[PDB]
């Protein structure tokens, strides 16, 4: 984040000290500077690594979900009057890759909700401004089965009531991990199968645990239905704040295939170029 070191002038050298020659077998990166191999002038460095900080790298709102809801009528079976979305950053790739640069992370989160609505037909009248309810459902809490069941009382569940046309809604969340850091990767299982029990029992998905269980968001339109159908989409933008990260990893090189590290397609990411072609 802070200023880089200056460059010191270097003249000709004739000595038994050989910074150029090293041994990478040790696993240590040679900390050479230009003045070690070539003659250098004095440069008072003014560049800084301020935008390379882990905070800056993640200080952007990244779309992570597009939740679709409808306001048509209870009778219509093809219209989804409410939508439940499991909270995760793995429905999108860009933030997922930036995060999976690191094994562990710990950060507060900022959720911004951009709601856009539209008509689906013209010859059924018009609609009044809609209010959307976004109810956070932590794991274990009752999940709505209908758009107007008791669960939406939100006596305890945090809930956001957004008026259409208002600026995108926004909330902040502290670090809510049950562990001391978020696990981008979990090399293990939630169950250990025990000798004796049937192959059906004890079988758990690889890499899946309750560390990444954060509940879901239930989104509905609070208004009663107008004689015409209205389709709305809530876009969720996640911004990490106060980011700490641990154990850097090589970034994803091939397309993601599911919530894990599985790959199936695009296994040839590199193009063809001659060895002696510039």
């Amino acid at each position: 984040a802070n200023n880089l070191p200056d460059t010191q002038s270097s003249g000709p050298a004739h000595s038994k000290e050989t910074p150029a020659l090293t041994a990478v077998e040790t696993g240590a990166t040679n900390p050479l500077v230009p003045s070690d191999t070539v003659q250098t002038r004095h440069v008072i460095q003014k560049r800084t690594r301020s935008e390379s900080t882990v905070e800056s790298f993640f200080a952007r709102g990244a779309c992570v979900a597009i939740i679709e809801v409808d306001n048509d009528a209870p009778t219509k079976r093809a219209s989804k009057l409410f939508s439940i979305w499991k909270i995760t950053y793995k429905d999108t790739v860009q933030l997922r890759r930036k995060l999976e640069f690191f094994t562990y992370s710990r950060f507060d989160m900022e959720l911004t909700f951009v709601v856009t609505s539209n008509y689906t037909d013209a010859n059924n009248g018009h609609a009044l401004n809609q209010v959307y309810q976004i109810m956070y459902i932590p794991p274990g809490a009752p999940i709505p089965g209908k758009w107007n069941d008791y669960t939406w009382q939100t006596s305890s569940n945090p809930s956001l009531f957004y008026t259409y046309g208002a600026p995108p809604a926004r909330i902040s969340v502290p670090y809510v991990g049950i562990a001391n850091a978020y696990s981008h990767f979990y090399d293990g299982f939630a169950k250990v199968p025990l000798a004796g029990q049937a192959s059906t029992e004890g079988d758990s998905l690889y890499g899946a645990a309750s560390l990444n269980d954060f509940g879901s968001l239930a989104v509905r339109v609070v208004n009663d239905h107008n004689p015409t159908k209205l389709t709305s989409k809530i876009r969720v933008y996640m911004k990490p704040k106060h980011v700490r990260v641990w154990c850097p990893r090589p970034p994803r090189a091939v397309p993601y295939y599911g919530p894990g590290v599985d790959y199936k397609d695009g296994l040839a990411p590199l193009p063809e170029k001659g060895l002696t072609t510039y």
Binding site: A13, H14, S15, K16, T18
Partner: peptide, 22 residues
């Protein structure tokens, strides 16, 4: 001892290891 005296102007007339980086 011996004595020497010059009798002329012009003095011509007087009597007679392995690792290295460059």
């Amino acid at each position: 001892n011996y004595t020497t005296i010059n009798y002329y102007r012009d003095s011509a007339s007087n009597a007679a290891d392995r690792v290295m980086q460059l």
